[PDB]
From a paper:
A set of ubiquitylation pathways conjugate ubiquitin moieties on target proteins, which are then recognized and degraded by the 2.5-MDa 26S proteasome holoenzyme. The proteasome is composed of a 28-subunit barrel-shaped core particle (CP) and two 19-subunit regulatory particles (RP)5–8 capped at both sides of the CP. Substrate entry into this chamber for degradation is controlled by the axial channel in the center of a heptameric α-ring, also called the CP gate, positioned on each side of the CP. The globular domains of a substrate are mechanically unfolded by a heterohexameric ring-like subcomplex in the base consisting of six distinct subunits, [name]−6, which belong to the ATPases-associated-with-diverse-cellular-activities ([name]) family.
Three of these correspond to the previously reported SA, SB, and SC states of RP–CP subcomplex, which were refined to nominal resolutions of 3.6, 7.0, and 5.8 Å, respectively. The structure of the ATP-γ-S-bound RP–CP subcomplex in the SA or SC state was nearly identical to the ATP-bound conformation in the same state13. Consistent with our previous report, the SA, SB, and SC states of the ATP-γ-S-bound RP–CP subcomplex all showed a closed CP gate.
Author numbering:
A (entry chain I): 2 to 251
B (entry chain K): 8 to 127, 134 to 241
C (entry chain H): 3 to 234
D (entry chain D): 365 to 418
E (entry chain B): 354 to 440
F (entry chain P): 2 to 205
G (entry chain G), H (entry chain M): 5 to 244
I (entry chain L): 4 to 241
The structure:
Amino acid sequence: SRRYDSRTTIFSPEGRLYQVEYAMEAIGHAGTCLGILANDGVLLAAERRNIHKLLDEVFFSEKIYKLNEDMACSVAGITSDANVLTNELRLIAQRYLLQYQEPIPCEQLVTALCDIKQAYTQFGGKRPFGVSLLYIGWDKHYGFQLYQSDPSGNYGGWKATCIGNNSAAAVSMLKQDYKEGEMTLKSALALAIKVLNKTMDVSKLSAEKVEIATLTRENGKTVIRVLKQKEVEQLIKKHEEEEAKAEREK
Amino acid sequence: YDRGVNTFSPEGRLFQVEYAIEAIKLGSTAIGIQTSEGVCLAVEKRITSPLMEPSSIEKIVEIDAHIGCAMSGLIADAKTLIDKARVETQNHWFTYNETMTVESVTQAVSNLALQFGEEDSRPFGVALLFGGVDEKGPQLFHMDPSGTFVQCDARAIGSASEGAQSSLQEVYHKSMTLKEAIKSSLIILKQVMEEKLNATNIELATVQPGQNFHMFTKEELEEVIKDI
Amino acid sequence: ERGYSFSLTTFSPSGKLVQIEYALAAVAGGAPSVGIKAANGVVLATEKKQKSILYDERSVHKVEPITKHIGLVYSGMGPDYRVLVHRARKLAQQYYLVYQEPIPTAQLVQRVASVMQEYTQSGGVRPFGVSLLICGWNEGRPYLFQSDPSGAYFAWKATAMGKNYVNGKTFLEKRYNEDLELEDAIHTAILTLKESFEGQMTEDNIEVGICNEAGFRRLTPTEVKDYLAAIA
Amino acid sequence: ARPDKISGADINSICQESGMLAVRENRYIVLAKDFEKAYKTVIKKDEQEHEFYK
Amino acid sequence: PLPDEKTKKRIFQIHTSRMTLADDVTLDDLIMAKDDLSGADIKAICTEAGLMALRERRMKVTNEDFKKSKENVLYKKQEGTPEGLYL
Amino acid sequence: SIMSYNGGAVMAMKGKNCVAIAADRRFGIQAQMVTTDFQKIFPMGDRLYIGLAGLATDVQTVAQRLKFRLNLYELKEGRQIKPYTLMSMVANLLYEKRFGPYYTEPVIAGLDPKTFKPFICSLDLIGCPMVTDDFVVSGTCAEQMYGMCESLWEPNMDPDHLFETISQAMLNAVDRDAVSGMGVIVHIIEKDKITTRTLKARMD
Amino acid sequence: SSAGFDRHITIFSPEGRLYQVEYAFKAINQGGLTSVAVRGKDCAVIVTQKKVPDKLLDSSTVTHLFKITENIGCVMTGMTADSRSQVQRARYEAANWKYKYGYEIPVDMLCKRIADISQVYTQNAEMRPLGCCMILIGIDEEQGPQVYKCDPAGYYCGFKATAAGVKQTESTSFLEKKVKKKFDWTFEQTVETAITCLSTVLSIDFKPSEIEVGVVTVENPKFRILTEAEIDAHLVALAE
Amino acid sequence: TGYDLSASTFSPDGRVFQVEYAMKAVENSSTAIGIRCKDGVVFGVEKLVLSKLYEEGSNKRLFNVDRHVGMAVAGLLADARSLADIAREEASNFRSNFGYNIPLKHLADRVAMYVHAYTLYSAVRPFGCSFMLGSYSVNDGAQLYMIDPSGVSYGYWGCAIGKARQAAKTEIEKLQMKEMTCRDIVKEVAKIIYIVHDEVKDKAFELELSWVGELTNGRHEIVPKDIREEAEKYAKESLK
Amino acid sequence: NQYDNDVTVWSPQGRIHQIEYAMEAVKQGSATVGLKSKTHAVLVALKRAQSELAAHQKKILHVDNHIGISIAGLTADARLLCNFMRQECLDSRFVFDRPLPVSRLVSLIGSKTQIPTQRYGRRPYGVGLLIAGYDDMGPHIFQTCPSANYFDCRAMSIGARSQSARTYLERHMSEFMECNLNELVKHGLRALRETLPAEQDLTTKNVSIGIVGKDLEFTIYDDDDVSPFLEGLEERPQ
Amino acid sequence: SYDRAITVFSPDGHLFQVEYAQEAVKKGSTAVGVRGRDIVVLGVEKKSVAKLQDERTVRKICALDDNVCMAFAGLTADARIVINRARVECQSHRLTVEDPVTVEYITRYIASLKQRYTQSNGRRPFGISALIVGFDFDGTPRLYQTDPSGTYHAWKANAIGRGAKSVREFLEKNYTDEAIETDDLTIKLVIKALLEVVQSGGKNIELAVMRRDQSLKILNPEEIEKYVAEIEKEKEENE
């Protein structure tokens, strides 16, 4: 009865949590997401996993989940586990809107999630969550924000971020392409399409394979703008023009 | 081979209780002595570094007014038994309007010395020394993780237990007085400690019918050590 | 029963869910099936070979309706199929009690996917060995969805599960196309089920259901025998 | 048809065993019971609680 | 234990005491740029440093190429950056 | 009466292609007003509203619960809600507390977001739905508004005659009741634009 | 194949199997019983046998013919304890069908119920999968008699003439050789095939005190176990 | 290895080893037999006295479940007393609820489903007890049922449970159930209970006899072993 | 030895090992001897101590106005079945307003200690009860076991090397019936003096004697009311 | 639910998960802290910051009440629940007895909670050590540390985390009673003690104080550079 137990909770005799490392190794597969340093805007990036010619494209969002008027998130890893986490998280945000008649700030939304993932890591004999997802949004106090999730439940706020294993090179590219407060959303989108060009291995950045969701603060709309391919393609040709121009130095 | 947490030995007894007994051996030492006048008691704080403040460490907490205590081994396991044993003494006093006798306290703890399991986790890793004066006189007691509770006239515990008992039957008789026993403990302590005996290492605790209370203050111990 | 309740599905050293991979192999050991969406409704085709001439085909049905406009077939094992069939049966009716409205298939696959993903993690079960195809005609555009033992959900134009799904997949890569009619989906569906069948296909072998936009109608062996006559 | 279901295979020379049960006869022209009995012994199959999905 | 800024600087400067690349090597910006990783690969990036410059047959540094060639090893350690928060 | 604790009323009159919902906002305790800026009409999505009347606690609380489940429903599916679905939502939300009831009588008025088909309905406190074609009323005063809207309602109404019809019916209806008053707000919504006007009412 | 504990509890192998159910498919074979069901035109016949290894054991208790309701009979194979424990759940769910839905249960739905409970025995990992094999008969409105079989894998299942147990791998091969022809099915044709299909298997041609025949027939639709005398009438009626 | 430990795991040859180990745990216990006559049920248990051990009448393996039903347990003893308390409680439920005395068939089902119910989980172990059930009612007749640790309950005219099991049920076919009165059947039991278990294994022994039927008028009780003392009067004269 | 794990697992020989290991926990306790006459019941125990200065751990504990039990083995479980013992005494003393006979008390000990010998994760009780009391039909001396098999004896003994006590008792069981208390007790603790090595006493500070009678409520004597019983015994032979 | 004893006694007497799970304390960020006679000073080091990204969300010195400061080591994820539970506990103490929370009470709360969090069924023990510093009512400053065993233990100064033997060995050369006769000697004493700590480039040194009546003041990187200036100039005076 106990000799069939798999012991998902215990420390392992070298120093570290044995299970959370193998949790993070699954986030290291199948995911690519990032966000950019942006004033008067904030953007998300998405990589199509299934780019086959046989899908329907009728969902109108493949990796972006709209969970309030003002916020969104980006699934990485095992997708339907995040389809538990967005039901839970959306219900947390909406019950805070019930209890206070006021929109939920993003920080306590993040901790209100990470106490649950942490609650499965602490006790249970239970398979942990395997989703490390991002956060964008507006709030009354701090303007614009970005956040980061872990299966351990430790969260950090970024200004440019890393999902997943292929995005560590995107972190080197973002520190090598660093700035302080320039958006000018064509600069941020040109940098983002640049990062998805040079990081993702498929050449020339086909217009189907990428996806960009932006958020512009408008009073009192706070538009979560998910843009279509017709304004992706001329952005791609803009970046290819910039590569053809910048290569002329040599 | 992690087997049943509640499984008997081939000898055999409880595996995890037998493993729990060995956890007393690495804890700090203590000395109890029953006197006809009262109960004296001794322990060592085991200062780890001059970083630490020495007087915040508790090895004696006093359960009621009239029932002393001494803990050992893992202290954080002991604190739970302390705080609940106090509740059992108060519940005795508020059903009964009389002082709970020193004996029934250790039944009221040792009846839950063994509650581990899965339904209905681990046994406790402490070896307590209870003192006190009820109407039956000054009693000195001793309980283990197994719950096997017995009276002991002059009990040692811990790492020093073998040499302290072994050296301690030589220097004990039936008509010991108090101030004889108090300086009769610190000889054994300064034999068994590794740091130099001074005002910060040990603490005494006495409880009497006519010397009470008479708890535990500093600068008494300065006079106590300098009588060596 | 005991409160053992530990998840026997854990992570690998590589990071792969092992029981979900093995459950997908148990999907690959199942019967073939294909389903095609085409421009007015969605046609689901399955492939049911009785192991003997003693058997009765009138008893067990594979195309199983969920509402009067929603069908549902599988590719996997039947005893794990019927449980979440009944779970979808009860599950649509709370939506019909609360909102008083015919439930969208998009909402069905969200909720059934929540049941299945939530079931991959709970106390001491294996996951289901079933990969579903869920069709239906809601709000004017007929839908076709596929779930899986990982709890995921896809939105295919015209897919196939079971045996030889790379064969029927490449066959439905070219021969399936932009837009057809309802009868024209049946031809290529019976053809791609005729990719990996035995030497004869009768009214007892295949069993084909459709969704009109006016409502569901599971087809009879009269027309199932008439269309495959006319080899595909 | 029927012996093809139980074939192992157990392919080439069990067909010769089907002929080596004709020498078991006792009959001039091999009876139907001779063939069927040859293939049914090897190899056995145990069904069906699982593969019934077909 | 894993080396610190004092050990890594004493690792590379002593390893290069016999042979440097184009001399001129300063260890202040080497340990400051990449944070962090063992002194193993610091010789590897310097192995390819004079190796890529060997296309010029002895000595030269291309600012656009050097930081691009450094990107390969920089991302190599920046793919597995988190653990954690190993802590 | 128990409904007469705060007073108040909601009228919604279907026109030709536009729908007008009006209510009062006086807020008080059985004889004594407190404020005038109280709100009994709530936005639910775009080009749709709900009126609420009765005991003010169930107005605010039922409004917040309906806004709760409504935001969860438009965040489950991308479409806006159809008004029949809203009616059965309010009917279930009232019927969950069957035995200890909420003391309110909601009025759902809004255009279908698919077309420009107007729609009005009103619900009992137990949760009985009712679809009409002319008008629904809900409040302490009801016989007054049935006295007006059965003599000023025409079938095919341009927004001018709809606005003036609901204006005369609300003013002359409320000025005969005692416990209500203190202003009349009129939401006239059409396919193009939502329009809110507050009339010039008696302050007594 | 094997990986981990898949040879012990009901979790998946790497090849897609699960071994506990395919051990349960030969948990029947300890019983030592051939049981054949034949659906006629207006009737259906169960045939079984018994083994009486002692003269002190009874003939009145070892009958596997268990009656579920007054229109539904059944017979059991596999091990005895799982078989009888299946029976009270069959009777109990039939009675709850009578209390809840008010009309007599069809023989179709009871096998879906038993198959789903046997699935819940299979699905959860810490409960034994009940290695018995369930066989039903019964009468329905305008559908004639019916025969169904429920294996301990959780599927309801029912055909024209079916038999599972020990010797039945060849008995199904005889019933394929006997069913597909131009012969109709009268009553004594079905009974006279129900014996001879089993007598081809065992090759004994024995006394009428061994086979138990339960039958149902739409003249009087109640399930009925034959008396030994008319069993002897059939058994010498087949001997030309 | 690994297939014998838990109870809920099938073995690859297709049987359950914890049940099979439970069957031969009763095999080490002493012989206790039973038999019915045309109007009563006679029990007999041989009991073991080595030197001193217990006062006469300790831990009697003959129990008394209802007014008209008794046990005759053999195997491990504590779980047999647990089954005595549970069968006691079940007779209390039927007696309280339906107003008339419990038939032996329902009692055999409701006990045997519990003995089966502890062979499906690794929460518990399978029982290690087997017991007789004798009874008599004028509208019922004498029935004698036999429950094994596996959960199989069926009906004997006569049975035997113990070490000397086969040798103690060899001779029962010499006796005749149909004609004999149970007053003969008392000494007709005690002759072979004295004959079986020869005294080289254990030096001494002691006999219990319990007897329910028409002569006791439905009530089950122990016969007064001193009264008529028919056992050893025949048994010392039965050696030659 | 992988089937020595838990109480659930049967052996391939048919002997559940956890019960055998708990019997080993019974044998490790000290000796105690209970023996009855027709008119009285006497149970005598032998204490042991941890050291010289620690007092001897007692065995015989008072339970009811006529029921008394000895003990060997574990102590905390003896307090557990002790508290259950008191509670089932004063339950029927509270309800029926009569004292309980012993022979229906011990079935609650068997059905009490049964369930922790079957279900998973439950140890048996290391226990050594020698129950003694009056019902209306005289005295009774029972014993228990962790396998919950209770024996109505005329005399038993359990504990360390208690078999020598038995082989004393069998050659006097024909004479342990008629005699009254004063020689019955010393007939008791002669078995205790055979449970010891023959070179140390047999002191006064260790032996405890409990008696239950008709005109004599259940009483425990401790070294000093024992001192009138230990006077006048025979010397141990050479 | 979840009935399994995770943490059991080893045969050599140790608990594993208690006396093993302090390795997660050993492989986290370091944090030191001294107490002045008037103003306390604690600070985290080895921050390992990305140095181009945000910093207020990685802030790991926080408050329960304004009376009480936090500092901890180990993995921060398990520390978050201990902090929030400690806050919910120390608010109901304000709902009771009207004095503010004494620091010894809240350390008995984290210590008792963490003990019964080791003791119970199916629960991995916490892998954090933590410090709890606060100048109480009646103006007296003191400090305590925690333990995954749950043994609160009053120090005069701190070393927890990576190389606690290094800094804890270093502060014996600190404890001259001149330090701290001035508060600027206390703060520059902490930073000069963190010189022997990890890299100490003026970036990963985050210090915070509490002036015995004030709310805790997170100091900007303004006077940390000036304390490195007078510390390095003092080392210029050291020869």
